[PDB]
């Protein structure tokens, strides 16, 4: 009986994709070749955040513009200020295996973790004075790929069990869940309307979600490998993602469909983290070829290259006013380009 | 202008004393190794180290420290974790090894086993870490051998026109037939890990039973060579 | 897009022959290594063979080395699994798996069950 089960949902993809090719009466390859190209991005390093000791697995700028986070593994996790460089804070992890961090917008929490299965938080305003454990999300059984705060008492975190989860920090249990995916989810982004969140697995796939409703109300297999890196286009309505395959792809959540691939026949290495800058005209994707690409959103040409990196890059970020640039690989030398 | 420069005197402060805790930490990181202990479930991975100085169970890794020679070595082993071991065995890319046991009693399952050693050999992140071979359950080995219920050529017929190497090291007392499965099956590791082999990293195999207890100076006298070679390659002496 | 059919199978008896097809889109198939594996009727899943980009470097299982022929053409992107002589422990489902990362020599898909790059699943049963 499992047959007619499978034929309806072929149907059901079938007219799909149908009606995405229907909606495909243009692409934005051809559209945008009246702008002006941005031309080279020239970006040196400003500072290096000098320090770290193990890989660093992940990092994450702060609303402020000015402090940011930078998890190893190591078993730390490390507050920078850019401006100077100054070591404001240095959480000891339980697991040295951590694999991604966040700072929240009001800058009050910090979360981590790793291969531990648990997203610890901890709290940076406390009146000790010194930093420690705030809560332990316990719960998923996969390790935890990447995390974000959705509010000083909502967070939300993807790991490697095939759901995505909504946390709540007073509570301490999955306050919602998402199981659409079918492989470990990898990273995931949150939009500026604060409700609605991509995320990308295994599955070679970028599911999106309501916080809300709970429920995946889109879906994009436009890529070909597991998806390592994904990002909110800054106004909320499109996002990039890059997968393995030496491939970026710009994804609308009005079209449901791709609109912009950015590829290189030279580039055979994958991708590991991508960002959007303060307006999205470019898009920024580091790559496992010990460098990061700065790619034109609206062209796909390689506009600028951070050549400047020892390992295989594992995050890079943008200011809240898209300033300066973060990268943090495998280096443990997290640059500061500008 | 003194509201601030008091500021900036409290953080230059806090990150001195930052620095030195970092400095403390270091100290005991670039002491201790860090190692990977991979392994199917049926495989006697969580008893290698029979000593087992001490056994840290963390949320969702069966962490193991110990100390040999004055050397602090710190085996991970990750068994609280999905199947799919693609994503986060990238973690592992910088131990100082992978010790990967394979429960070659069970040759339904030997297949699957060396499935995993080659994904793992050929691993793109893995591919400057050794992989140390610890071909554990030898007795069982032995006993399934000497039973004859079970023919290796049903799993593995080049078993049936294979011949024991010149280099081995027959135990006292052993059967022709014991010792031959076993090289057998080393060598096809042997094989299955210079299929893609190359000067970046090396296979250690070592024949352990699920009783032994000198598995800790083994993996001393792995890490050792595993480092030296390192080194010598960076000297360019090999 | 990423998708992966299977055709063939079905009965067969003891000693004969079988070639099983699968058709995968989305992708460039001349970039990923690929592998045929089996999952028995209450038995876990068990790798068969593998075949790499351009066919130079196959590896096929000791249980069924030599029986089994694994063959992929990139002009269509399709891949074959001609099996001959089949025995009565070959009835099981079989799958055509794609390597997880191009341009590599490592793939974990008989790690897992749950695992993506599949197709739905090709029966052979073996009997008179």
């Known amino acids: 009986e499992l047959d007619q089960l499978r034929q309806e949902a072929e149907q059901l993809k079938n007219q799909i994709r149908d009606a995405r090719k229907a909606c495909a009466d243009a692409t934005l390859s051809q559209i945008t070749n009246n702008i002006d190209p941005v031309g080279r991005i020239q970006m040196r390093t400003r500072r290096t955040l000098r320090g770290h000791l193990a890989k660093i697995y992940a990092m994450h700028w702060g609303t402020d513009s000015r402090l940011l986070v930078s998890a190893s593994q190591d078993g730390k996790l490390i507050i920078w200020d850019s401006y100077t460089t100054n070591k404001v804070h240095a959480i000891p992890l339980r697991s040295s295996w951590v694999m991604t961090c966040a700072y929240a917008p009001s800058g009050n929490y910090v979360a981590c973790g790793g291969l531990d299965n648990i997203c610890s938080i901890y709290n940076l305003k406390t009146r000790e004075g010194n930093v420690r454990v705030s809560r332990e999300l316990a719960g998923h059984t996969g390790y935890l790929s990447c995390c974000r705060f959705l509010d000083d008492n909502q967070i939300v975190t993807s790991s490697g069990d095939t759901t995505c989860a909504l946390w709540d920090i007073e509570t301490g249990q999955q306050t919602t869940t998402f199981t659409g995916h079918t492989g470990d989810v990898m990273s995931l982004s949150l939009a500026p309307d604060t409700r609605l969140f991509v995320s990308g697995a295994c599955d070679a796939s970028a599911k999106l979600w309501d916080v809300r409703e709970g429920m995946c109300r889109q879906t994009f297999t436009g890529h070909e490998s597991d998806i390592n890196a994904i990002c909110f286009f800054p106004n909320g309505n499109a996002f990039a993602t890059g997968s393995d395959d030496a491939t970026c792809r710009l994804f609308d959540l009005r079209a449901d469909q791709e609109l912009m691939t950015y590829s290189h026949d030279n580039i055979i290495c994958g991708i590991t983290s991508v960002s959007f800058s303060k307006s999205g005209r470019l898009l920024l994707a580091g790559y496992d070829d010990f460098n990061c690409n700065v790619w034109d959103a609206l062209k796909a040409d390689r506009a600028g290259v951070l050549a400047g990196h020892d390992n295989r890059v594992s995050c890079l970020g943008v200011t809240d006013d898209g300033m300066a640039v973060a990268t943090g690989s495998w280096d443990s030398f997290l640059k500061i380009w500008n | 202008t003194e509201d601030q420069r008091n500021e900036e005197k409290a953080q230059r402060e806090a990150n001195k004393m930052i620095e030195k805790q970092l400095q403390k930490d270091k100290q005991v990181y670039r002491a201790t190794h860090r190692l990977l202990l991979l392994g199917a479930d049926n495989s006697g991975k969580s008893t290698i180290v029979k000593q087992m100085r001490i056994y840290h169970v963390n949320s969702g890794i069966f962490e193991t420290k110990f100390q040999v020679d004055k050397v602090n070595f710190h085996m991970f082993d990750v068994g609280a974790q999905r199947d799919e071991r693609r994503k986060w065995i990238q973690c592992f890319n910088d131990v100082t090894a992978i010790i990967f046991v394979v429960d070659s009693s069970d040759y339904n399952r030997l297949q699957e086993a060396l499935n995993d050693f080659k994904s793992i050999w050929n691993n793109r992140w893995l591919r400057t870490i050794s992989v140390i071979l610890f071909l554990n359950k030898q007795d069982l080995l032995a006993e399934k051998v000497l039973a004859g219920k079970s023919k290796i050529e049903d799993y593995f017929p080049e078993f049936a026109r294979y011949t024991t190497p010149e280099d081995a090291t027959p135990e006292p007392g052993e059967d022709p037939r014991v010792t031959r499965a076993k090289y057998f099956i080393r060598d096809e590791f042997l094989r299955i890990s210079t299929a893609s082999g190359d000067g970046r990293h090396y296979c250690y195999p070592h024949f352990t039973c699920s009783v032994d207890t000198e598995n800790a100076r083994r993996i001393f006298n792995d890490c050792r060579d595993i480092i030296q070679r390192m080194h010598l390659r960076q000297y360019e002496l090999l | 897009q990423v998708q992966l059919q299977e055709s063939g199978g079905g009965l067969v008896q003891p000693g004969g022959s079988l070639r099983l097809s699968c058709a995968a889109s989305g992708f460039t198939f001349s970039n990923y290594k690929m592998n045929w594996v089996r999952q028995a009727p209450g038995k876990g899943l068990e790798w068969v063979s593998d075949?790499?980009?351009?066919?130079?470097?196959?590896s096929y299982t000791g249980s069924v080395k030599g029986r089994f022929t694994i063959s992929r053409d990139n002009a269509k992107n399709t891949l074959y699994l001609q099996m001959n002589s089949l025995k009565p422990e070959d009835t099981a489902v079989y799958y055509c798996?794609?390597?997880?990362?191009?341009?590599?020599?490592?793939?974990?898909?008989?790690?897992?069950?749950?695992?993506?790059?599949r197709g739905q699943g090709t029966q052979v049963t073996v009997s008179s």
């Open positions: 075949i790499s980009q351009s066919g130079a470097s196959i």
């Open positions: 798996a794609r390597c997880p990362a191009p341009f590599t020599r490592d793939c974990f898909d008989v790690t897992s069950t749950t695992y993506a790059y």
